[PDB]
Amino acid sequence: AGILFEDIFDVKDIDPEGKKFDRVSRLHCESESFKMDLILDVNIQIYPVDLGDKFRLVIASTLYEDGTLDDGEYNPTDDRPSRADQFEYVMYGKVYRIEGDETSTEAATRLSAYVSYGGLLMRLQGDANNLHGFEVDSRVYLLMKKLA
Amino acid sequence: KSMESVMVKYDATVRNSINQVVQLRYGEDGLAGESVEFQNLATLKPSN
Amino acid sequence: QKRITTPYMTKYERARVLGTRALQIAMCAPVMVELEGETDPLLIAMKELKARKIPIIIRRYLPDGSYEDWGVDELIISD
Amino acid sequence: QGIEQISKVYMHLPQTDNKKKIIITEDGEFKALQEWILETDGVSLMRVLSEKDVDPVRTTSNDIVEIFTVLGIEAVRKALERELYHVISFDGSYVNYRHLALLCDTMTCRGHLMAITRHGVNRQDTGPLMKCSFEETVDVLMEA
Amino acid sequence: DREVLRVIFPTGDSKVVLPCNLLRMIWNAQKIFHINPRLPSDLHPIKVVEGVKELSKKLVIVNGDDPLSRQAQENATLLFNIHLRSTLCSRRMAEEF
Amino acid sequence: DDEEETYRLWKIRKTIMQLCHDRGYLVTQDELDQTLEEFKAQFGDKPSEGRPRRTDLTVLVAHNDDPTDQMFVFFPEEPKVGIKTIKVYCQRMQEENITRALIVVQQGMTPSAKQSLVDMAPKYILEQFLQQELLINITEHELVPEHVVMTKEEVTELLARYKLRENQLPRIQAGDPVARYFGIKRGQVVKIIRPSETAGRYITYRLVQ
Question: What are the boundaries of the signal sequence (chain A) (predicted)?
Fold first, then answer.
């Protein structure tokens, strides 16, 4: 499947500190299944998001849903079936930091994964087992679908 | 005019036209000013 | 043997070796390197420097009055 | 009372760390102590250093000539570096130390304070042609 | 080296000017070789100790084996070698880098 | 005042002990770290019309390498040292056969006496020191780096390593306060060790001239 993480999030705050940028809002969302905390920068102009909105978030290493690596270049002419067809908001980014509660001896129980989608930042907190597919410097796809 | 002749010689010392030693090594470390960078000594500040 | 000066070619030696060799090439001196569609004497000297084929010896005068003769091939080029 | 040539003495607590007293504690940390420092309007370095309750290790004069005649050529070499560093870095400007160190070395290489004027640059045993190009073109060449 | 530094910088200002940016060089190495900070390292701690010792000998400012040249070489690179040792130490090469 | 004046005598003596120790002369540890009370107890009174006399404060020390070699430190009582006073010390040095001596003058030396020291310089080395100068150890100042007098063997090694001539080194005046502190004559080389913010440590050499 090539899916690193999938869950349903509910928007709690849209911009707690304030509207830092006009076309981008910082969503503060929490999941109910895995109880993962999500901070996400979204292009609010093209994909408006409101408080209490529920959406399905999928973090995948590829869009082709066949295991084939995208190679990270723009290929609009590709007709291969894409997992992006099922989602409304698709972002391509790079994970640049993986933090955790690890100590010198004990491992990490909570992991934070930071992804930059061309400058739009996402932090995904929660149990380490839920973020084992995240490896720093790896390219990931963010796929969002608002749920009614 | 007071330093136009001071130069780094091939023995790596700094001397004037008179060939008198101004510095045994340029800058006391023998390095040029373009390459060095600001850096932090990590062992100075921290406590025992 | 018994050389105390740096094994690297200085920026000032590179500037004069290339300039001096370019003039020699410009004056119909034999080119030690194989050139393909190169006609600028200064670019040819760069190829020879990279190939370590410049037939020039740098004589570095020490402050005490002595000198060390280095072949351009012996010295380490910055590139 | 007091010492001659010292007209006014200012006492104040140095807020900046440069004039503060930085020590190493038992734990090995760097602790800055808020201690009084006196700044005078005149220079009597030799007299003031000998005074009781005056620190003879850090007490310093901004007068380069006073440092030379009291502490020596190497002390004035360091003092000259600090004073020159003060004017350069006063506005936050930065110059690599090697350039500052080189100027100070040339001004103290001969064992005495050499000014960067004609009285110090033409007195050094350089060739007359170098001297004539700087200043006193004819007087330098007439003497040669 | 810590005590030597305390004498050189009694004010405790650790900001210095040195030739090579070791922290950025380490950062370059992490990216070039795709170092994974989470996984255990295969770099033996002794290789770090021996490797730095060999490196220090290669960084020569005052060549010569006589005691006068050796002392000047030690003095010329004293600050960098202290910075090099406290950055490429075995503890830190295995703990954070 | 006498409490203030006795403080000067103790402080001046302490600098002399450090000066003698720094010159290689055998000065015992307790002499260097001698408290004012210990000095006051040792002499047991105050200067003015009391036990501690500048004549009784004279110090004799012997070089560590050569026990026969020795040095006097004389504290003349008169404010201005005259020719007769120097001859008294000069005659005394003959009895003990001591070549080098130090005269800690109160205010200054009469010009004839100053010339007298130079006249007898070859046979006997007499060094004038002002009382104000000795009240502090300039070598302990932060601006003053570590000065080390180089042996002739070391100086030969130094010039050979750098292929240098004596006149090519940086100079230090013979009248330099640190040069006077170490009693270095013309032609000697001082090894100055400095902390360097770039290199960490820097050694420079100054010829006395």
Answer: none
Domain enclosing residue C26, as ranges = 1-79
Residues near C14 by beta carbon (within 8 Å), at least 6 away in sequence:
C49, C77, C78
Any idea what DSSP says for residue F48? T
Residue window 85-144, chain D: list those with CB within 8 Å of chain E.
96-97
Among all residues of chain F, which has the CA nearest to that of D70? F177
Distance CA F209, CA F207 (A): 6
Bridge partners (DSSP) listed for residue E29: none
What tokens were used for D89? Answer: 């870095």
Nearest neighbour of C5 by CB, restricted to B10, B15, B19: B10
Helix pair angle (E78-87, E67-76), 10° resolution: 60
Q: Closest to F192 (Cβ–Cβ): which among D67, D69, D74? A: D74
Number of H helices, E strands in chain E: 6, 1
Contact yes or no for F199 and B28 at CB 8 A: yes
Distances (CA, A) of A72 to A6, A50, A81, A117, A121: 21, 31, 17, 13, 18
Three-class SS state of D40: strand
Residue extents of the structural domains in chain A: 5-148
Interface contact B3-D28, CB threshold 8 A: no
Give the orientation angle of helix E78-87 with respect to helix E22-32, to 10 degrees: 40
Q: What is the largest CA-CA distance in chain F?
A: 61
Structurally, chain C folds into a number of domains equal to: 1
For residue F42, the number of C-alpha atoms closer than 13 Å in the C-beta half-sphere is 15
CB pairs under 8 A between A and E: 8
Do A130 and A34 meet the contact criterion of CB atoms below 8 Å apart? Answer: yes
Rounded Cα–Cα distance for residues A14 and A9 (Å): 13
Integer Cα distance of D123 and D110 in angstroms: 11
Burial bucket for residue C58 (CB in 10 Å: 0-12, 13-18, 19+): buried
Question: In angstroms, rounded to a whole number, what is the distance separating the alpha carbons of residues E56 and B5?
Answer: 33
CA D45 to each of CA D103, F3, F138: distance values in angstroms, whole numbers, following the listed order: 25, 23, 11
For residue F116, give the H/E element and its range: helix F111-119
Chain D nearest CA to B18, separation (Å) = 6
CA distance readout (Å), A58 to A3, A11, A87, A129: 7, 15, 9, 16
Beta strands in chain A (DSSP E): 3-13, 24-31, 37-43, 54-60, 89-100, 110-117, 120-127, 139-147
CA distance A142 to A38: 12
Tell me which residue in F141, F172, F194 faces D71 most closely, judged by beta carbons: F141
- Against chain E, the chains showing at least 3 CB pairs within 8 Å are A, B, D, F
| Residues of chain B neighbouring E18 (CB-CB closer than 8 A) | 36-37, 39
Q: Do F198 and B31 touch (CB under 8 A)?
A: yes
E68 vs D31: CA distance, rounded Å: 38
Interface check for F199 against chain B (CB to CB < 8 A): the answer is yes
Cβ neighbours of residue A111 closer than 8 Å, sequence gap 6 or more: A98, A99, A100, A101, A125, A126, A127, A128, A130, A131, A134
> Is E17 in Cβ contact with D97 (below 8 Å)?
yes
**Cα E28 from chain centroid?**
16
